[PDB]
Design a binder for this molecule. Structure first.
Ligand code: F43
Ligand SMILES: C[C@@H](OP(=O)(O)O)[C@H](NC(=O)/C=C/CCCCSSCCS(=O)(=O)O)C(=O)O
Ligand SMILES: C[C@@H](OP(=O)(O)O)[C@H](NC(=O)CCCCCCS)C(=O)O
Lengths: 568, 247, 432, 432
C-alpha cells in the first residue's frame, strides 16, 4: 500500500536524516549506503545524558559503583549516531531507552492488566445455591451480589468483626464486571457491572461470541495491580475465588462457612475458572497466569483491535506488537533471562513501519493473485497448500529483503539479523494466514521465509535463533504428541518455542491473522475477547503499539503505586 | 569416489559459495605467523602454546575404539587451549557471509567448532589448529580487510552503512585505511598492539561485487536465481510433508 | 507372624488364616494386576473428539477455533475405529492389548499391552500411545488433509504440548500426569475419590477396599512400609481395607440401626480390650482408666478399622458424603479421650480430618469429599488410612453433592466399572 | 520389515539378519532388562552420609546445622550396612534384590527387587526404599536416639520433603524425579550426557548406544513410535545407535585420519547412492543434481548414522566435547546443501544443534555438552537422534571441560559402570 510505503519512508527520514538530541544527523539520503561516524559517545542523546548524570550521583550517594558508560569495553555507547524510533502507525517519536519495559509504565501495566485478570463462571455457583440451599437466584440477587463483590474484591470485609482492609486509594484498579450470552439476563443486570456484548461488538461478532458461549454468565475479575506486583500470576485466581466466596456468603445469607461454600470454592478455583495461561514445567517452573502459559490465541483475544477494526492486516499487526513486547521484552528478556534484555529485538516489529510496509505489500499481492483472498471474508479464502505458501511466503520475503537492500537506513535500523528475520517471517506468516484462514499455513509461511532469508544473505539471526526454525517446517503439520498443535493453541511453552526471541509475538500475529482475515470475533477464546472489551482497564488493549508510545513519552499512568503510604 | 557438488546456482554468487565451501580460494595477501598470533590476542607472538590439559601421550587415554580410529589434531595431541578467530562481514558485498565461512571450516578443517550469527562468525578449535584456519581466512579472498574485520567482541557493523572510504564501521576501531592499506593495530578484542599489522589494499567495490557470496538486488538478485529458490522450495516441501508422514 | 480371615462386603468368609505379608502390594498377584491394569488403561471419548472436530471447541475451557470444522462420524464408525486403534496400540498380534467400544460407540476402553509398561518409566504410554493411535486412525479413516492435521490431532490431545497435560482433550485414565505428584512415589495416590466410587459402582466397602489398595501401593512406593513399617501398614490395610475378621462389617451391623460415632468407639474399644490388644495401665483418682496398647501396630489397625466403620455409620445414616471429614476427626479425637491411647496414625488421621473439614467447608480451596485424594495437599498426610473412608463416603451419598460422581467420573465409571478386579477388589485380593 | 547386521564398537559382527522390530524397547528382552534395571537401581554415598552426619552439612548448598554432630563410621562398616540394607530393600528372601559395596565402602549399589517396580507407578521406589533402608540401618546400627532421628534421616534424604527432591542428600539413580519431566513419557530422556559417558567408561560408541536405547525407549513411551513411526524410529536406532551393517564404524575408520564433517557427508551420500536409497531426480541448469529419496525413513537413518559418524570424527579429532553442537548443525545443513534432501529428523537435528550451539557458548543457560539430555529444554526436540552424539562427544573429551564426567557423575560412574549390560549395551542388545 502506497500510504504505508510513504509512511515507512517518513520513519527512515525522521530516524536518519533529521537530527536527534545532538547527533548531528541533519540532511542526507535514506537510500544512500554511507555514513559519517562522529564517535560522539552517549552524551549525544538526551536520555543517555540524564541516565549518566543520575548514575554518577547515585553511585556517589550510595557509596558503591553503579551506572557508568565508561565501563563498556573499548568505547562507550554511540560511536555511531544514536537515532530514535517512530511507533508504527503513529507520529510518536521515542527515545530508544524509553522503550525498555523497565523504563516504560505502559508496557509494565499491559503485563499487570493480564497477570491480574481471570474469568470465573457464575452458572455453577448459582446452581450450587439452588441445589444445596434451595435459594432462588434472580437479577436482583445478582445485582446485590455484584455490589457486595465490588466492595469485597479490592480487599474489604463483609462478614467478620474487627477486620483490617486494603486502602481503597491503593487498589482503585480492582473491580469485577460480568458478561453473559443471555440477552435477557444482560438487560436486567445493573449496567454499571455489565460488559455489553451487543454494544461493544459489531452485530456479526456479537452473534459469533454469543453462539460460542451460549447462555452462560461470566465474571471478568481484575485484582489489584499492587497485589499482582507484590506476588505473582498464580495469585490471581486464588484472590478472585476468596472474595467471590465471601460475597456469596454475605449476599445470600449463607452460613459463613458451610459445605456448600466449598462447592463455590471448587467452581471458582477450578471447575468454572478460565486462566490467562496454565502452569509451566520444572526447568522454567511457574504457576498459572505467567507469560509462558499465555497461548498465542489468548493474547490475540486480549488485544482488542479485532473488535474496533475491519482491516485484517492492522488487527494482526497490533497483535504482533503486543506480542513481541510481552513475550520478548518482559517474558524472554526478563522472566527467562534479564539485564539489558531484548528491547530492540521487539521494537523491530512495532516501530518505523517496516513490518507494516512488507505486510501491506503482501495484502496487495495476495488480492491481485488470489482474487481478493486477503480481504475480510470467509468464502474468498484459498485452501492451504504447499504451492500457495511457497508463492506467498517467497514473494513476501523477496520484497522485504529488496526493501532492506534498497533502503540502507532500514537495514541499519534492523541491524540485527534476528530483527530482520522476525520482520520478514511475520509478514510472510501473516500473509499466508490472511489468504488461507489457516493459522498453521501461516506457520509454514513463517518458516519458509526464514529458509529464503538464510540462502539470500548467507546469514539469519543470532547463534540460537533458528532452533525452532529448522524444526519449524516439519513440525507445522506433524500430528505427533509433543509436535502437533494448531497455532491458536501454541504458546511460549510449545517445546520448540520455549527459549528464543523474535518468534512468539510473530506466532501470536499469525494466529490472529487467520481469524482477522475471516472477520472472526475471536482467535481461540471468546471469554477473553469479551473480558477485555472494557475501557475501564488502564491499558488500551485496542491500540497496544500506540500505548507503548504513550509510555515512552511518560503520558501513561500505571496502577499500583504506593506514594500514598510512602514519605513525601 | 563421491565428489561433492556443494551448492546450487549458476550465478557468480554460486561460483563464490562453491569456492568458499570447497576451500578453492585465491590467496590475495600474506600475514606472518607472529602478526597473526598478535591480532588473535591469545598469547605473545612466537611463544609456546599454553595448555588446558596434559598432552595425550603424557596422560594416556581411555580404551575407546573411536579415539583409536580417529587421529587427534596436533593441537589436541598437545593439549592446547581451545581459542578462536571471529569475523564480521559487511552486507555490502563483503566476499564472505557467515554460513559460508562456517561451511568452509566444517568442510576443510579437522576438529573445528564453527558458529554462525548475522553479525559474526567464529571458529573455535585447539589453538594451533585454529591458527591454520585463521591464516587461510585472513590470506585468501574470503576476507576483504575493509569490508570485514576480525572481532572477538563488539562486532556491530555488518548491517551498518559503510564509511565513505568503503570501510565497515568498527565501534572499537581495530583496523582502518592508512596510506591506502588496511592497518590492524589492535587485537580482535581491541587491546592495542605494539605493532601495526599491514593487511594490504582493500578490494574495489567492483571486485567485491564479483567475489561476494551474498545476494543483493542491486548486484546478483536472489529473486532471479530460480535454481537456488527451487532448492529451498524442495527442502521446504520435503521437511513439511515428512513431518506429517515420512513417506 | 500375623494372619487374618478375609470377608467380603456382605460379611461372607472368602479366605482363612491369610498371612498379612501376602497382602503386600509387592507380593500380592491380584494387587499387582490391579496396578498394572490401572497403569495401562485409558478411556477415549469418541463423542468428545467428534464434537471438537465439528465445532472447533478443543484445547480447554472456553476455547473454540472458528472456520476449521471437520465432520467425521466417529461414533457411527466406532467398531472399525476400535479395530484400527487396537492394531496401532498393540505391540505383537495376540498380546494383552484390549480395545473395547463403550456405550454404543461414544467411548473406547484402551488397555495398552503390558510390554509398554515394562518398557516405560511410568504409565503415560497408555495415554500417549492411546492418543497417538486414535489420531492416526482418524487421519487414516477420514483422509484428513495435512493442512488440517493440527485440528484433528488436538481434537484428541487438546492443548498438549502447550499445556503439560492433554487439557481439553479426550483421552484420560484413572491416574494423573507424573508432574502433578506432590512427593516421591505418589502417582498411585493421585486418584480422585469420585473415580474410586464410580469404578466400584457406589459399593461403599468395595470403594474403601480399592482405595486402600491404591493408597498402600502408594505408601509402599514412597518407602513408607520398610522394616517394622511393613507389618504396620499391612495390619492397617487388612483390618481397615479388607474387612479382616469381619470386624468392620460386624461393627457396622451392630451400629447400623441407631449407632453414632460414639457407639462405634464403644464397639472398637470393647473389642480391643476383649482381644487383649489394649489393657488398663493406670486408674486415675477420678476412676478414669488410662490404657496402654500391648501391640501398637495392632491398636493402630483397630483405630483404622474403627475410623472406617464410623464413616459407614455416620455418612450412611445421613446418606451424605460431607459427614466423612467430621467422622475422621471426631472418631479419633473422642477415641483418645476414651482411652488415653493415640488415635489412628498417631494423630495423623485426625490431622487430615481437621484440614479436610476446613477445606470441605470454606472459601479457600478443596471442594466436596469427591475431589480429594492421597496426593491432595489437604489429605495426603495420613499413611493411607483416611482416603478409603472418603471414597466410602462419596459412595454413600444419596444426592447432596454438586460435584457428583457422574459429573467428574462418568467416562471413568463406564469404562472401568466393567472389569471384575476393580468392582470386586476384596474378592480379587483374596483370590475369588 | 528391515533386517540389519549388528556390529560392536570394534567393527566385529555380533548378530546377523536382525529384524529391526525385534530391537523395539517394547519387544527386546535385553532393552527391557536395561530399562527395568535402570528403574530399580540407585547409588548411595556412604562417605557423603558420614560427612553430613559429622559436620551437619546436609540439605543443600551452603547448609550446615551446628551443634548436632553424629560420628558414625559408615565406611568402615559398609559390608554390615549393605547386608542390613539388603534385608530391608528385599521383598522376599532370594528375590532379585542386590546390594553391593562399591569403592572400598564409600558407596553402595542398591538394586530394588523388580516386584517394587511392578507394584509401583514409576521408578522412585528404588530411591525411597533405598533411602529408607539406609536410614533405618543407620538408626539401628549406630543407636540414634529419637531426638537425633531427624539429623540421621536428613544426612540421607537431604531437604526432602521441603524440597521436591533429595536436595543435599546421598541417594540418586541415573534418572531424575518424575516432576522434572517436561513432557509425557520423558523420564527415560532425563539422563545427563555425563552420566552416560561415565557408565560406559568413556567408550564413545557404547555411550552413543546406551543413550540411543534410553532415547528411543523415551520416544516409544511418548507415543512417538506408533504405526509407520515404529519402523522410522527403529531404523534410526539400528543405523545410528547399534552400528547397523558396520556403517557408522566403517565411515569413522575411512574418515579417521584426515576426515572432516565435509568428507563424512561424502561418505554418507556415496553410500546412499550406491545402496539405492537415493537417486538424482533432476539436474539443474548449473549441473547441480537434486536428489530424491527412494525410501524416506531409510534416508533419515543414513542421515542419523552420518550425524553420529561426523561427531566421532570431529569431536574425535579435537578430543573436545564442544565440537558436537556444530557437528550436528553443519553435518545436516551441508548435507541438505549437497543433495537437496532433508537432513536428519527433517530439520530437527539441525534445529536442536542451533539452540544447543547457542546454549553451549552463551550467557543464557545450558553449559558444556555434558549437562544436556533428552528432557532438557534445549535438546529435547529431535526424536532421539541428537543426544547419543552428545554422549559420544562427552566420552571423547580429553580434558577441555569444567563440568567433567567426574564432577557431575563420579558416583554414578563408580556404581552403575560396574554393570555389564550398561557398560556394553551393543553386546547386551545383540545377546552377546
Ligand atoms: C555477548 C553476546 C553473546 C550472547 O550470548 N549474547 C550477547 C550478549 C548481549 C547482551 C549485551 C549487553 C552488553 O552489551 O553488555 C544482551 C543485552 C543480553 C543481556 N545480558 O542483557 C544482548 N546481547 Ni546480543 N543483543 C542483540 C543483538 C545481537 C546481535 C548484534 C549484531 C550486530 O551487528 O550488532 C548479535 C547476534 C547476531 O550477530 O545476530 C549479538 C551477539 C551477542 N549477544 C554477543 C555480543 C556480540 C558482540 O560482541 O558485539 N547480539 C541484536 O541482533 C539486536 C538487539 C540485541 C539486544 C538487545 C535489544 O534487543 O535491545 C541484545 C541483548
Ligand atoms: C488447598 C489448595 O487449594 P485447591 O484444593 O483449590 O487446589 C491450595 N490452597 C491453600 O492451601 C490455601 C491456603 C491459604 C489460605 C488458607 C490458610 S488457613 S487461615 C484461614 C482461617 S479463617 O479465618 O478462614 O477461619 C492451593 O493450591 O490453592
Ligand atoms: C535453557 C534454560 O536454562 P538452563 O539450561 O536450565 O540453565 C532456560 N533458559 C532459557 O531458555 C533462556 C531464554 C531467554 C534468553 C535467551 C533468548 S534468545 C531456563 O532458564 O530454564
Amino acid at each position: 500500500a502506497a500510504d504505508i510505503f510513504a509512511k515507512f519512508k517518513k520513519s527512515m527520514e525522521v530516524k536518519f536524516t533529521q537530527e536527534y538530541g545532538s547527533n548531528k544527523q541533519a540532511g542526507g539520503d535514506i537510500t544512500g549506503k554511507t555514513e559519517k561516524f562522529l564517535r560522539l559517545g552517549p552524551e549525544q542523546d538526551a536520555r543517555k545524558q540524564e541516565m549518566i548524570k543520575a548514575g554518577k550521583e547515585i553511585a556517589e550517594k550510595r557509596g558503591i559503583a553503579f551506572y557508568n558508560p565508561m565501563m563498556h569495553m573499548g568505547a562507550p555507547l554511540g560511536q555511531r549516531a544514536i537515532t530514535p524510533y517512530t511507533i508504527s502507525g503513529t507520529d510518536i517519536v521515542a527515545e530508544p531507552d524509553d522503550l525498555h519495559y523497565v523504563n516504560n509504565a505502559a508496557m509494565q501495566q499491559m503485563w499487570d492488566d493480564i497477570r491480574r485478570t481471570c474469568i470465573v463462571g457464575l452458572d455453577m455457583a448459582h446452581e450450587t445455591l439452588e441445589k444445596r440451599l434451595g435459594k432462588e437466584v434472580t437479577p436482583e440477587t445478582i445485582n446485590h451480589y455484584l455490589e457486595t463483590l465490588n466492595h469485597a474484591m479490592p480487599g474489604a470485609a463483609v462478614v467478620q468483626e474487627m477486620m483490617v482492609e486494603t486502602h481503597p486509594a491503593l487498589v482503585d484498579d480492582c473491580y469485577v464486571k460480568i458478561f453473559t450470552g443471555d440477552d435477557e439476563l444482560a438487560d436486567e443486570i445493573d449496567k454499571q457491572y455489565v460488559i455489553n456484548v451487543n454494544k461493544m461488538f459489531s452485530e456479526e461478532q456479537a452473534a459469533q461470541i454469543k453462539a460460542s458461549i451460549g447462555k452462560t454468565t461470566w465474571q471478568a475479575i481484575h485484582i489489584p495491580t499492587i497485589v499482582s506486583r507484590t506476588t505473582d500470576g498464580a495469585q490471581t485466581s486464588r484472590w478472585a475465588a476468596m472474595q467471590i466466596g465471601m460475597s456469596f456468603i454475605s449476599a445470600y445469607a449463607m452460613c459463613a462457612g458451610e459445605a456448600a461454600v466449598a462447592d463455590l470454592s471448587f467452581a471458582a478455583k477450578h471447575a468454572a475458572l478460565v486462566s490467562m495461561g496454565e502452569m509451566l514445567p520444572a526447568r522454567r517452573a511457574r504457576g498459572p497466569n505467567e507469560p509462558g502459559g499465555l497461548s498465542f490465541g489468548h493474547l490475540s483475544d486480549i488485544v482488542q483491535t479485532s473488535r474496533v477494526s475491519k482491516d485484517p492486516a492492522k488487527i494482526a499487526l497490533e497483535v504482533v506488537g503486543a506480542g513481541c513486547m510481552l513475550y520478548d521484552q518482559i517474558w524472554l528478556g526478563s522472566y527467562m533471562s534479564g539485564g539489558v534484555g531484548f528491547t530492540q529485538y521487539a521494537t523491530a516489529a512495532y516501530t518505523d513501519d517496516i513490518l507494516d510496509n512488507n505486510t501491506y505489500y503482501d495484502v496487495d499481492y495476495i488480492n491481485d493473485k488470489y482474487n481478493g483472498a486477503a480481504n475480510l471474508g470467509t468464502d474468498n479464502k484459498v485452501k492451504a497448500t504447499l504451492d500457495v505458501v511457497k508463492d506467498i511466503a517467497t514473494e513476501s520475503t523477496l520484497y522485504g529483503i529488496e526493501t532492506y537492500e534498497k533502503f540502507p537506513t532500514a537495514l541499519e535500523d534492523h541491524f540485527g539479523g534476528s530483527q530482520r528475520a522476525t520482520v520478514l517471517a511475520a509478514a510472510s506468516g501473516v500473509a499466508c494466514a490472511l489468504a488461507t484462514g489457516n493459522a498453521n499455513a501461516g506457520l509454514s509461511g513463517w518458516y519458509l521465509s526464514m529458509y529464503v532469508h538464510k540462502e539470500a544473505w548467507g546469514r539469519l539471526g543470532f547463534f540460537g535463533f533458528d532452533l525452532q526454525d529448522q524444526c519449524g517446517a516439519t513440525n507445522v503439520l506433524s500430528y505427533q504428541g509433543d509436535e502437533g498443535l494448531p497455532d491458536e493453541l501454541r504458546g511460549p511453552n510449545y517445546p520448540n518455542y520455549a527459549m528464543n526471541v523474535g518468534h512468539q509475538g510473530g506466532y501470536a500475529g499469525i494466529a490472529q491473522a487467520a481469524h482477522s482475515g475471516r472477520g472472526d470475533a475471536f482467535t481461540v477464546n471468546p471469554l477473553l475477547k469479551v473480558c477485555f472489551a472494557d475501557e475501564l482497564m488502564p491499558f488500551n488493549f485496542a491500540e497496544p503499539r500506540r500505548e507503548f508510545g504513550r509510555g515512552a513519552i511518560r503520558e501513561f499512568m500505571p496502577a499500583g503505586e504506593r506514594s500514598l503510604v510512602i514519605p513525601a | 569416489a563421491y565428489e561433492a557438488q556443494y551448492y546450487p546456482g549458476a550465478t557468480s554468487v554460486g561460483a563464490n559459495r562453491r569456492k568458499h565451501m570447497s576451500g578453492k580460494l585465491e590467496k590475495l595477501r600474506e600475514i606472518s605467523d607472529e602478526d597473526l598470533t598478535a591480532v588473535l590476542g591469545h598469547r605473545a607472538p612466537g611463544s609456546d602454546y599454553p595448555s588446558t590439559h596434559p598432552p595425550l601421550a603424557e596422560m594416556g587415554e581411555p580404551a575407546c575404539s573411536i579415539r583409536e580410529a580417529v587421529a587427534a589434531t596436533p593441537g589436541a595431541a598437545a593439549g592446547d587451549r581451545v581459542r578462536y578467530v571471529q569475523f564480521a562481514d559487511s552486507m555490502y558485498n563483503a566476499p564472505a557471509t557467515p554460513y559460508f565461512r562456517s561451511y568452509f571450516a566444517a568442510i576443510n578443517f579437522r576438529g573445528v567448532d564453527p558458529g554462525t550469527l548475522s553479525g559474526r562468525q567464529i571458529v573455535e578449535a585447539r589453538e594451533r589448529d585454529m591458527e591454520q584456519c585463521a591464516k587461510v581466512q585472513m590470506e585468501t579472498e574470503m576476507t576483504d580487510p575493509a569490508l570485514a574485520g576480525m572481532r572477538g567482541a563488539t562486532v556491530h557493523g555488518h548491517s551498518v552503512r559503510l564509511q565513505e572510504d568503503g570501510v565497515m564501521f568498527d565501534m572499537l576501531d581495530r583496523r582502518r585505511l592508512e596510506g591506502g592499506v588496511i592497518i590492524m593495530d589492535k587485537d580482535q578484542v581491541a587491546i592495542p598492539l605494539d605493532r601495526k599489522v599491514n593487511l594490504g589494499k582493500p578490494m574495489s567495490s567492483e571486485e567485491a561485487a564479483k567475489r561476494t557470496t551474498i545476494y543483493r538486488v542491486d548486484n546478483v538478485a536472489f529473486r532471479d536465481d530460480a535454481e537456488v529458490i527451487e532448492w529451498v522450495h524442495r527442502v521446504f516441501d520435503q521437511r513439511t510433508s515428512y513431518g506429517f508422514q515420512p513417506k | 507372624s500375623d494372619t487374618v480371615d478375609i470377608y467380603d462386603d456382605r460379611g461372607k468368609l472368602l479366605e482363612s488364616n491369610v498371612d498379612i505379608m501376602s497382602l503386600a502390594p509387592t507380593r500380592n498377584a491380584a494387587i499387582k494386576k490391579i496396578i498394572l491394569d490401572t497403569k495401562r488403561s485409558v478411556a477415549v471419548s469418541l463423542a468428545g473428539i467428534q464434537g471438537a472436530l465439528a465445532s472447533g471447541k478443543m484445547g480447554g475451557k472456553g476455547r473454540q477455533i472458528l472456520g476449521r470444522g471437520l465432520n467425521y462420524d466417529l461414533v457411527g464408525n466406532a467398531d472399525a475405529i476400535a479395530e484400527n486403534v487396537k492394531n496401532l496400540v498393540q505391540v505383537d498380534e495376540g498380546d494383552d492389548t484390549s480395545v473395547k467400544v463403550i456405550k454404543g460407540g461414544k467411548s473406547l476402553l484402551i488397555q495398552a499391552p503390558s510390554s509398554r509398561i515394562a518398557a516405560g518409566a511410568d504409565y503415560m504410554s497408555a495415554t500417549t500411545v492411546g492418543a497417538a493411535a486414535v489420531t492416526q486412525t482418524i487421519i487414516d479413516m477420514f483422509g484428513t488433509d495435512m493442512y488440517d492435521a493440527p485440528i484433528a490431532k488436538s481434537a484428541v490431545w487438546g492443548s498438549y504440548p502447550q499445556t503439560m497435560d492433554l487439557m481439553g482433550g479426550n483421552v484420560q485414565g484413572v491416574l494423573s500426569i507424573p508432574q502433578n505428584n506432590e512427593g516421591l512415589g505418589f502417582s498411585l495416590r493421585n486418584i480422585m475419590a469420585n473415580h474410586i466410587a464410580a469404578i466400584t459402582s457406589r459399593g461403599a466397602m468395595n470403594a474403601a477396599a480399592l482405595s486402600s489398595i491404591y493408597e498402600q501401593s502408594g505408601i509402599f512406593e514412597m518407602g513408607g512400609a520398610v522394616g517394622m513399617f511393613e507389618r504396620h501398614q499391612l495390619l492397617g490395610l487388612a483390618c481397615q481395607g479388607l474387612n479382616a475378621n469381619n470386624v468392620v462389617y460386624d461393627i457396622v451391623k451392630e451400629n447400623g440401626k441407631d449407632g453414632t460415632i460414639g457407639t462405634v468407639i464403644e464397639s472398637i474399644v470393647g473389642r480391643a480390650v476383649e482381644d487383649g490388644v489394649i489393657s488398663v495401665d493406670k486408674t486415675a483418682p477420678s476412676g478414669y482408666k488410662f490404657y496402654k496398647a500391648n501391640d501398637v501396630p495392632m491398636w493402630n489397625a483397630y483405630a483404622a478399622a474403627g475410623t472406617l466403620a464410623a464413616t459407614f455409620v455416620n455418612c450412611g445414616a445421613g446418606r451424605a458424603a460431607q459427614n466423612v471429614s467430621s467422622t475422621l476427626l471426631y472418631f479419633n479425637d473422642i477415641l483418645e479421650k476414651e482411652t488415653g491411647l493415640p488415635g489412628c496414625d498417631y494423630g495423623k488421621v485426625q490431622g487430615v480430618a481437621v484440614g479436610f473439614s476446613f477445606f470441605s467447608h470454606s472459601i479457600y480451596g478443596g471442594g466436596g469429599p469427591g475431589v480429594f485424594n492421597g496426593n491432595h495437599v489437604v489429605t495426603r498426610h495420613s499413611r493411607g488410612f483416611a482416603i478409603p473412608c472418603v471414597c466410602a463416603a462419596v459412595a454413600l451419598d444419596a444426592g447432596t453433592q454438586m460435584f457428583t460422581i457422574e459429573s467428574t467420573s462418568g467416562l471413568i465409571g463406564d469404562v472401568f466399572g466393567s472389569i471384575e478386579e476393580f468392582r470386586q477388589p476384596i474378592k480379587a485380593v483374596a483370590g475369588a
